[PDB]
Write a protein that binds this DNA or RNA. Sequence first.
DNA 1: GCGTGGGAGTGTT
DNA 2: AACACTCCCACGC
Length: 118
Amino acid sequence: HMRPFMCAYPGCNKRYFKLSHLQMHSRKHTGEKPYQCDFKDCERRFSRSDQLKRHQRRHTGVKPFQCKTCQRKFSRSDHLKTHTRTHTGEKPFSCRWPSCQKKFARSDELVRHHNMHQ
DNA sequence: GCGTGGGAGTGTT
DNA sequence: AACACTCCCACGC
Ligand SMILES: [Zn+2]
Ligand SMILES: [Zn+2]
Ligand SMILES: [Zn+2]
Ligand SMILES: [Zn+2]
């Protein structure tokens, strides 16, 4: 005998003989943070799937993004982008305090500068 | 200054 | 939905 009922979630193929058991299962997808890491002793939950798959690069230590200049590898592409700013010397973020023409290569660098102005 | 995590907005298929 | 880019914010050295 096979079960009549099923979860309509795209990926949950759990089937139940009883409707009561499917009802309890249906509330598992009503997800505070559905995506959870299943690496040993991490169990960290995330809101999106791509955020979890980015986090799991910590357990594997993979660095798929490499700098074309200094050959250094990085775990994420955005961190590679600002690393290239270290080589090219560009500083888009400029301080907007009077009589202070100071530029930085990262937004959080300018924020730290704006706070030290006070 | 700069590596390197999480959150979130957006785009392409 | 999967996948990716890209930004801010934050922690750390
Ligand atoms: Zn389900
Ligand atoms: Zn994990
Ligand atoms: Zn480099
Ligand atoms: Zn300034």
